[PDB]
Structures are given as structure tokens and as C-alpha cells.
Design a protein around this ligand. Structure first.
Ligand code: P5T
Ligand code: ZN
Length: 257
């Protein structure tokens, strides 16, 4: 079973998932001087006013908040996308210390954490079909730096003690993901992959330029989670990030000058 440790981490994943060495893997370093401004890119449309959160879950690799994706209630459109993408879940990647934790990097800078909002293309009907398509998913990535608290994150932080170990879940209704977004929707975009197994090459990545700030207390609570199940030796859930992968033949485009 894959993980983030010495014997089962990112350098091992290609054995079970050979696409790990593919042509469009994620994350990548975003070299800001090389990314090209594309004036043909549209503003991103984020429509989360009718979002219906369901549950919060420790899945042994991260924690996730899951949404009702059975109707067009929380959707991503525009930007680099053709068509409509339904929000399924969000989750985070973070470090053992504030100088690492993000998956994407910016001019080799690592942020303390990275938020991923995962959406799937309604033209494929369900997420399982969407991951088999090159335009199946759109993941909105948001960097976290440590400073001032993010008020809209606190409701998440306060329930993490109830999902400490792998397999635990709780009710998590009425959570508004608009409270996790920065002011600007300026972004970089490129064609890539899931950053966890199965590493499928099905993602249009949209990475926001502006980070959100979270407090040291908020990120400390992330770091109290466990990779292990209850009853097994305690292993802190920290450093659950894949490093930057080769860009190969891809262009990163910027929505802004
Ligand atoms: N880190 S990341 O690339 O956002 C990880 C994706 C986590 C998931 B969970 B299940 C598999 B991969 B696809 B489905 B659903 B859909 B979502 B995406
Ligand atoms: Zn992720």
C-alpha cells in the first residue's frame, strides 16, 4: 500500500502505477519568468453559493471534505475550461515544518501547504469515467502561507480531533468553501495529472497566484492527524506531498501580465 514514507513513498509509486513516469505528471515547478501570459484565457468562474458539503474523512493520506455532486450546485467554468465541472471534494497537502508542504512550487519556493478543490467534467457523467479522459478533471490549487488566521478554515480545524486516524469520518454539513478563497483569481494553468495514485493524466490544473494566510495554530492541528489506523503505531500525517515532476513538453500559461 502506497504512502509517503521511505519504503512506500513517491519514488516507489511507478512500480504499481507506471504512468508515474509519464508525459504529463503533476505537480511541477512554475517558473514565473517562463510562463506565458495568454490574453485569450478567460476569467475563472467559481460558483459555490449552492454548495452542499456532506462529510469530512481521514483517508490515510490526507483529510477531505466531500460534497453532493449529483446536481450542478458548486461548479467551475471558464478560465481554460470548456464546459462545466462539479465540485466533488477538497483536501490539503502539508509539511512537518513551514518551509515545505506544497506540491506545486513557484520559482522553486515551497509553501507550508496546498489546498486542492477537485472538480469533474459533467459531460462524462461520473468521476470514475472522467478520470479516464484527458479533460476529465479540473483541480483548483491554492497555496497556504503561515501568518494571520483564515477565519473560513476554522470550522475544518475544529473537527480534526474527531477524525484523527485512517477511516474515521464525521458529519460536515453547511460548510461554505468560498471562505477558503484568496481575493484574486489570477492563475497559472497547464495539463497534468492526479498527484496521488492512480496518477491518471486527466487533470487541467488551475493554480492561483495569490496564497491564503493561515495561522500557526491552524496548521499545527493538521500536523496532529495520523496516517495510521487506531490501534497501530502512531505516525504523524505530515509531509503528504509529491515533489515536482519533469515538465517535459508542456507550456504553463498565465491569466495575468
Ligand atoms: N492530489 S489530487 O491530484 O487532487 C488527488 C485526487 C484525489 C482523488 B479522489 B478519488 C481519485 B483521485 B480521483 B477520484 B476522487 B478523484 B479525487 B481524484
Ligand atoms: Zn491533492
Amino acid at each position: 500500500h502506497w504512502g509517503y514514507g521511505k519504503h512506500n513513498g513517491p519514488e516507489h509509486w511507478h512500480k504499481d502505477f507506471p504512468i508515474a513516469k509519464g508525459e504529463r505528471q503533476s505537480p511541477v515547478d512554475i517558473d514565473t519568468h517562463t510562463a506565458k501570459y495568454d490574453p485569450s484565457l478567460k476569467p475563472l468562474s467559481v460558483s459555490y453559493d449552492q454548495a452542499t458539503s456532506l462529510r469530512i474523512l481521514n483517508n490515510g493520506h490526507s483529510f477531505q471534505v466531500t460534497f453532493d455532486d449529483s446536481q450542478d450546485k458548486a461548479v467551475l467554468k471558464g478560465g481554460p475550461l470548456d464546459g462545466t465541472y462539479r465540485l466533488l471534494q477538497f483536501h490539503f497537502h502539508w509539511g512537518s515544518l513551514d518551509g515545505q508542504g506544497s506540491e506545486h512550487t513557484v520559482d522553486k519556493k515551497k509553501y507550508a501547504a496546498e489546498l486542492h478543490l477537485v472538480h469533474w467534467n459533467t459531460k462524462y457523467g461520473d468521476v470514475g469515467k472522467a478520470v479516464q479522459q484527458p479533460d476529465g478533471l479540473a483541480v483548483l490549487g491554492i497555496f497556504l502561507k503561515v501568518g494571520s488566521a483564515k477565519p473560513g478554515l476554522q470550522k475544518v480545524v475544529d473537527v480534526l480531533d474527531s477524525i484523527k486516524t485512517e477511516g474515521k469520518s464525521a458529519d460536515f454539513t453547511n460548510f461554505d468553501p468560498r471562505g477558503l478563497l484568496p481575493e484574486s483569481l489570477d492563475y497559472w494553468t497547464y495539463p497534468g495529472s492526479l498527484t496521488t495514485p492512480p496518477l491518471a493524466e486527466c487533470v487541467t490544473w488551475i493554480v492561483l497566484k495569490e496564497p491564503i494566510s493561515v495561522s500557526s495554530e491552524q496548521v499545527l492541528k493538521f500536523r496532529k492527524l495520523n496516517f495510521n489506523g487506531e490501534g497501530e503505531p502512531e505516525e504523524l500525517m505530515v509531509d503528504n506531498w509529491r515533489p515536482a515532476q519533469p515538465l517535459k513538453n508542456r507550456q504553463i500559461k498565465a491569466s495575468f501580465k
